[PDB]
Amino acid sequence: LSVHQLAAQGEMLYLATRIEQENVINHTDEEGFTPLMWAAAHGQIAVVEFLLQNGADPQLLGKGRESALSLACSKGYTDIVKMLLDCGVDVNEYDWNGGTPLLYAVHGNHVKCVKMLLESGADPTIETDSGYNSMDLAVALGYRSVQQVIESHLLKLL
């Protein structure tokens, strides 16, 4: 099983073995995804920790500029988001799908993730090419708790 797959399944033994045999920790697949990205996408906290501790680069992006952060944000994997935020990744980066970590957190109704992003410097007034920001999206989708967190943050700034 590829290192990506071992990561996605949380197969700590086989994954730890493989990092010994070959230097493959940052090896990308066809879509530019690192094992770390696969681990983030599947909410494998233990694996994410293992990978970061063993040289995995959290800033590496997919072909469509996908990030480990946005992948974890989109699913509401709060514990992984914290870890990656603590790596010092950019919070405000866009991908080709026009999404940012905040927009994916908002889209998924992940209130805790939204709070965490905003506290890490994610800017809720940055817009997609369509002209809507994170507040707009929260209002559009009817996510009232998410709306309040964003509005509260904005209010404290002004």
């Binding site: 026009g98 999404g99 994916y104 999206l137």
Partner: peptide, 11 residues
């Protein structure tokens, strides 16, 4: 294959 949701896209 890890996937992100398609987000709203306005004309």
């Amino acid at each position: 294959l890890p996937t992100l949701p398609k987000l709203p896209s306005l004309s």
